[PDB]
Write a protein that binds this ligand. Structure first.
Ligand SMILES: *[C@@H]1O[C@H](CO)[C@@H](O)[C@H](O)[C@H]1NC(C)=O
Ligand SMILES: *[C@@H]1O[C@H](CO)[C@@H](O)[C@H](O)[C@H]1NC(C)=O
Lengths: 522, 53, 65
C-alpha cells in the first residue's frame, strides 16, 4: 500500500519541482510550498502507521529494510508551524541564492552561471578576479546569513525528533557506517602527499605568472587565483600549469567548434557510448521533453541542479545547461550515468529506489566519464591525439586530469566537515566564517584575498549550503570511481598503463557493472 | 571517595556550576554592561582576521 | 572603591579562565592526533583567537612553536 500511494504522490511532487525549476514565478513558489505540505502530510501519515510496527522482531530483510527506511519522517517530523517555517526558510534561501546578481553600480550586471563563472575562468587579471570573487561572496553570503542559523536550528530539531543526534548523524546514516568519519580521514591522509605536491607545483606556476607581490613561494595561494569561484576544481584551465607545451598536446577547444557539436548531439554521443558499453538506452521522450539549452526569455532555471527522477518509471529528465565545452561533455556523461542508475532499478520498490550509497550514484555516473576522457577514446571519436605514442603527452593528460579529481578531494571533504561541525553545535553562530576559513587554510592551501571579517557568510556562496544537500557524497564518489575504473579495466583483459586504459565494447565489464548496480538499496 | 561526594560535603550539590562566579561579579558585570552600552561598543571581535602588523 | 576592587579581581581571575581552558584543550587535541605536526602553532593561535580573543603581534610562521 505504501508503494502504491507513494508512487503517485512522489510523481506529482517531482512534476511540481519541474514546474518550479523551469517556469520560475511566484505562483510556482506557492504551488511548490503547498505540494511540499501535501507530500509531508503523506509521509507523516505513512511513517506514523509504520511506527506501530516493530523492525527488530521482523524475520526478514527486504520488508525489514522497507520498514526501517520508512520509520523516519525526515522533515515531516516537525510540528505544523515549525514545518511551515522550515519550508519557507529553505525556499527563501534557495530563491535568494539563485537570483543573486552582483555588479558594478554603473548599470551593467552579471549572473553567476552565465557570466561570473565564465569571467572568472577566462580572465587573468588579479583585480577583475578579486572584484568578481569578493562581490559574489559578499552578496550571496550576506543574503543567506540572515536565514542560516534558523535553518540549522530547525534541521537539528527535525533530526532529533527523528531519533538521530543533531543532524550530523542523520546525514552520516545514509552510508550505514558507524565508523565513516575515521575511514574518510584515513583516505584523506592517504591522498594528502599527492595533493601537496600538486599544490606546490600550481603555486610555482602562479608565482611565475602573477609575480611575487600577490603569491609567495612559502605560504597559501589566494582562493580567487585558481579558476573557480570556490576553487573546488582549480586550474581545470591548465594553460598556465602545463608542464611542457608540446606539439601533439590536445587542444580540445576547436575540436568541438568546426564540427558544430551541439549539446543535443553531445548527449547523443554520451548515450551512444553508454549503449555500446552494453547498457539499456534512455527513452526517446527524454530529448524532446527535457531541456538542456539556453531559454527564449529571461527566466530559465535555478543556477545549478542535477538530473530529476519522477519515480513513475518514464520520466528521467536532465536539467543541466552549460552551452558547449569539454567539461560540458564530462558533466553530460555524469548526468547520463545518474539517469541510467535511476533507470536500472525501476523494478525495485519505491522505498529502495534510491541507490546503494549516496556516493555510488556519482561514482557509477563518473567512472565511464573518466574512461572516455582518455586520449585514446578521443582519438577513436572525432579527434586525433598521440594516445600512448609519446610519454610527454601522457604526462600532460595526467596533469590535466589531476587538476580535476584532485584539489577537489580537499574541498569535498572540507565542506561537509564544516557542515557536520556546525550542525553538532561545535561552531557557534558568532564564528561561522572564521572556522570555515580555518578549514580552508588547513585542508586546502588557500587564503582569503581580502580580510574577511565576521558578518561575511562565505560558506553560503556554495550552492549546496543553502540548498541543504550533503556534499561528502562527492568525496566518497571521487574516492570510489577510481576503484570502479580499476576493476572495469581489469575486466577488459589488460591493465598496463592504467592511466590510459579505455573501456569500449567491454561486454563483460558492463555486465559486471550491471549485476552489482541493479541491486539498488536492497 | 570520589569528587562529587566532597563537592556535596563542602557545599550541598555534587556538581560544578558557574553561578557562584557570576553572582560574585554581578555588580561589576552590571556596571561594565552599562559603561559599554554608554560608550557604544560591540561585544566580541567581529574583525577576527586582523593583525596589528 | 567596590568597583575598583572588583575590577582588579576580575582582571586577576576571569582574564585567566579562558587561557587555562585553551591550553589543555590544545594539548588534548595534540595527544589525540588531531593536530599532527605540520600545524602546531596554527591551531594554538586559532584557539587563542577563538577563546581569549588575542592576535599574533608579528606573523607567526610555522616552525615557531
Ligand atoms: C509558464 O508560466 C506562464 C506564465 O504566464 C503560463 O502562462 C504558462 O502556461 C506556463 N507554462 C506552461 C508550459 O504551462
Ligand atoms: C494534512 O492532514 C491534516 C490532518 O489533520 C489535515 O488537517 C490537513 O488539512 C492536511 N493537509 C493537506 C494539505 O492535505
Amino acid at each position: 500500500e505504501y508503494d502504491r500511494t507513494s508512487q503517485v504522490v512522489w510523481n506529482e511532487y517531482a512534476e511540481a519541482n519541474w514546474n518550479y525549476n523551469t517556469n520560475i514565478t511566484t505562483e510556482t513558489s506557492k504551488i511548490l510550498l503547498q505540494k511540499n505540505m501535501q507530500i509531508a502530510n503523506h509521509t507523516l501519515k505513512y511513517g506514523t502507521q509504520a511506527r506501530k510496527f516493530d523492525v527488530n522482531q521482523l524475520q526478514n530483510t527486504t520488508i525489514k529494510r522497507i520498514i526501517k527506511k520508512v520509520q523516519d519522517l525526515e522533515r515531516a517530523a516537525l510540528p505544523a508551524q515549525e514545518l511551515e517555517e522550515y519550508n519557507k526558510i529553505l525556499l527563501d534561501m534557495e530563491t535568494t541564492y539563485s537570483v543573486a546578481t552582483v555588479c558594478h553600480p554603473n548599470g551593467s550586471c552579471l549572473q553567476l552561471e552565465p557570466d561570473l563563472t565564465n569571467v572568472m575562468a577566462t580572465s587573468r587579471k588579479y583585480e577583475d578576479l578579486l572584484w568578481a570573487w569578493e562581490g559574489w561572496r559578499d552578496k550571496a553570503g550576506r543574503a543567506i546569513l540572515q536565514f542560516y542559523p534558523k535553518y540549522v536550528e530547525l534541521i537539528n530539531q527535525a533530526a532529533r525528533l527523528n531519533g538521530y543526534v543533531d543532524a550530523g548523524d542523520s546525514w552520516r546514516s545514509m552510508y550505514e557506517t558507524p565508523s565513516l568519519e575515521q575511514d574518510l580521514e584515513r583516505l584523506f591522509q592517504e591522498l594528502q602527499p599527492l595533493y601537496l605536491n600538486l599544490h606546490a607545483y600550481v603555486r610555482r606556476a602562479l608565482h611565475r605568472h602573477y609575480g611575487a607581490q600577490h603569491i609567495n613561494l612559502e605560504g597559501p595561494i589566494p582562493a580567487h587565483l585558481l579558476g573557480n569561484m570556490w576553487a573546488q576544481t582549480w586550474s581545470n584551465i591548465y594553460d598556465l600549469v602545463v608542464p611542457f607545451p608540446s606539439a601533439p598536446s590536445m587542444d580540445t577547444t576547436e575540436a568541438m567548434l568546426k564540427q558544430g557539436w551541439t549539446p543535443r548531439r553531445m548527449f547523443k554521443e554520451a548515450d551512444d557510448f553508454f549503449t555500446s558499453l552494453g547498457l539499456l538506452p534512455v527513452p526517446p521522450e527524454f530529448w524532446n521533453k527535457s531541456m538542456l539549452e539556453k531559454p527564449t526569455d529571461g527566466r530559465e532555471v535555478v543556477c545549478h541542479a542535477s538530473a530529476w527522477d519522477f519515480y513513475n518509471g518514464k520520466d528521467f529528465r536532465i536539467k543541466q545547461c552549460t552551452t558547449v565545452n569539454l567539461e560540458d561533455l564530462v558533466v553530460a556523461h555524469h548526468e547520463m550515468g545518474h539517469i541510467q542508475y535511476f533507470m536500472q532499478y525501476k523494478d525495485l520498490p519505491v522505498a529502495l529506489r534510491e541507490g546503494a550509497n549516496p556516493g555510488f550514484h556519482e561514482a557509477i555516473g563518473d567512472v565511464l566519464a573518466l574512461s572516455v576522457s582518455t586520449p585514446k577514446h578521443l582519438h577513436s571519436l572525432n579527434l586525433l591525439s598521440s594516445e600512448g605514442g609519446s610519454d610527454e603527452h601522457d604526462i600532460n593528460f595526467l596533469m590535466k586530469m589531476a587538476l580535476d579529481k584532485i584539489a577537489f578531494i580537499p574541498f569535498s571533504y572540507l565542506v561537509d566537515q564544516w557542515r557536520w561541525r556546525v550542525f553538532d553545535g561545535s561552531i557557534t553562530k558568532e564564528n561561522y566564517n572564521q572556522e570555515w576559513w580555518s578549514l580552508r587554510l588547513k585542508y586546502q592551501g588557500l587564503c582569503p584575498p581580502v580580510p574577511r571579517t565576521q558578518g561575511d557568510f562565505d560558506p553560503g556562496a556554495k550552492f549546496h549550503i543553502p540548498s541543504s544537500v550533503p556534499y561528502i557524497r562527492y568525496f566518497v564518489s571521487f574516492i570510489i570511481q577510481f576503484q570502479f575504473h580499476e576493476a572495469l579495466c581489469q575486466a577488459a583483459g589488460h591493465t598496463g598503463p592504467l592511466h590510459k586504459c579505455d573501456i569500449y565494447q567491454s561486454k563483460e565489464a558492463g555486465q559486471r557493472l550491471a549485476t552489482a548496480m541493479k541491486l539498488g538499496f536492497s | 571517595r570520589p569528587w562529587p561526594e566532597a563537592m556535596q560535603l563542602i557545599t550541598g550539590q555534587p556538581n560544578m556550576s558557574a553561578s557562584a562566579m557570576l553572582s560574585y561579579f554581578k555588580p561589576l558585570l552590571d556596571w561594565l554592561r552599562t559603561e559599554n552600552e554608554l560608550h557604544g561598543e560591540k561585544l566580541g571581535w567581529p574583525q577576527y582576521n586582523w593583525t596589528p602588523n
